[PDB]
Design a protein around this motif. Structure first.
Motif, PDB file in Angstrom:
ATOM      1  N   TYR A 101     126.597  53.687  68.138  1.00 35.58           N
ATOM      2  CA  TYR A 101     126.197  52.419  68.697  1.00 35.58           C
ATOM      3  C   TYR A 101     124.786  52.779  69.355  1.00 35.58           C
ATOM      4  N   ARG A 102     123.936  51.800  68.857  1.00 34.17           N
ATOM      5  CA  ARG A 102     122.349  51.496  69.339  1.00 34.17           C
ATOM      6  C   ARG A 102     122.058  50.450  69.115  1.00 34.17           C
ATOM      7  N   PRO A 103     122.284  49.167  69.718  1.00 36.85           N
ATOM      8  CA  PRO A 103     121.983  48.035  69.232  1.00 36.85           C
ATOM      9  C   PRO A 103     120.458  47.480  69.599  1.00 36.85           C
ATOM     10  N   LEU A 104     119.733  46.971  68.416  1.00 39.43           N
ATOM     11  CA  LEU A 104     118.364  46.556  68.654  1.00 39.43           C
ATOM     12  C   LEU A 104     118.362  45.032  68.597  1.00 39.43           C
ATOM     13  N   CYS A 105     117.368  44.454  69.228  1.00 43.71           N
ATOM     14  CA  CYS A 105     117.312  42.987  69.258  1.00 43.71           C
ATOM     15  C   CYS A 105     116.374  42.570  68.323  1.00 43.71           C
ATOM     16  N   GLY A 106     116.484  41.780  67.451  1.00 43.59           N
ATOM     17  CA  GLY A 106     115.473  41.194  66.652  1.00 43.59           C
ATOM     18  C   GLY A 106     114.295  40.542  67.145  1.00 43.59           C
ATOM     19  N   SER A 107     113.680  39.696  66.723  1.00 41.13           N
ATOM     20  CA  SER A 107     112.588  39.016  67.389  1.00 41.13           C
ATOM     21  C   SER A 107     113.100  37.728  67.931  1.00 41.13           C
ATOM     22  N   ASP A 108     114.174  36.952  67.153  1.00 44.43           N
ATOM     23  CA  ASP A 108     114.885  35.890  67.614  1.00 44.43           C
ATOM     24  C   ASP A 108     115.477  36.062  68.884  1.00 44.43           C
ATOM     25  N   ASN A 109     115.679  37.295  69.229  1.00 49.37           N
ATOM     26  CA  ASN A 109     116.430  37.550  70.774  1.00 49.37           C
ATOM     27  C   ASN A 109     117.971  37.678  70.103  1.00 49.37           C
ATOM     28  N   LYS A 110     118.435  38.206  68.984  1.00 49.64           N
ATOM     29  CA  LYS A 110     119.633  38.542  68.797  1.00 49.64           C
ATOM     30  C   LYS A 110     120.122  39.979  68.893  1.00 49.64           C
ATOM     31  N   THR A 111     121.221  40.220  68.936  1.00 49.15           N
ATOM     32  CA  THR A 111     121.611  41.632  69.303  1.00 49.15           C
ATOM     33  C   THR A 111     122.313  41.969  67.751  1.00 49.15           C
ATOM     34  N   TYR A 112     121.980  43.398  67.398  1.00 51.18           N
ATOM     35  CA  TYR A 112     122.569  43.817  66.291  1.00 51.18           C
ATOM     36  C   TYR A 112     123.241  45.191  66.574  1.00 51.18           C
ATOM     37  N   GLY A 113     124.323  45.287  65.952  1.00 48.91           N
ATOM     38  CA  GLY A 113     125.453  46.677  66.243  1.00 48.91           C
ATOM     39  C   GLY A 113     124.417  47.710  66.223  1.00 48.91           C
ATOM     40  N   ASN A 114     123.501  47.819  65.310  1.00 45.23           N
ATOM     41  CA  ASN A 114     122.659  49.197  65.394  1.00 45.23           C
ATOM     42  C   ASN A 114     121.565  48.937  64.448  1.00 45.23           C
ATOM     43  N   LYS A 115     120.636  50.136  64.318  1.00 46.83           N
ATOM     44  CA  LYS A 115     119.508  50.047  63.506  1.00 46.83           C
ATOM     45  C   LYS A 115     119.918  49.425  62.031  1.00 46.83           C
ATOM     46  N   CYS A 116     120.930  49.926  61.388  1.00 51.15           N
ATOM     47  CA  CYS A 116     121.575  49.637  60.279  1.00 51.15           C
ATOM     48  C   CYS A 116     121.710  47.737  60.061  1.00 51.15           C
ATOM     49  N   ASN A 117     122.813  47.643  61.080  1.00 51.91           N
ATOM     50  CA  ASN A 117     122.881  46.218  60.724  1.00 51.91           C
ATOM     51  C   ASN A 117     121.498  45.101  61.022  1.00 51.91           C
TER      52      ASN A 117
END
Length: 56
Positions: free
Chosen positions: A20-36
């Protein structure tokens, strides 16, 4: 590419680990991790791009 973002040159990958390592896109959305996260970038014609790591 030594900035605060991940490289989407190796995407999209048809397999994402579970670490688990969530990354936030530019729209401010969280993603489970780098892959998603990138799967979003590659699905958005690299028009998404993240602003910061972790969740928003």
């Amino acid at each position: 590419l030594a900035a605060v973002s991940v490289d989407c040159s190796e995407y999209p990958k048809p397999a994402c680990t579970l670490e688990y390592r969530p990354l936030c896109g530019s729209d401010n959305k969280t993603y489970g991790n780098k892959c998603n996260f990138c799967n979003a970038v590659v699905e958005s014609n690299g028009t998404l791009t993240l602003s910061h790591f972790g969740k928003c």
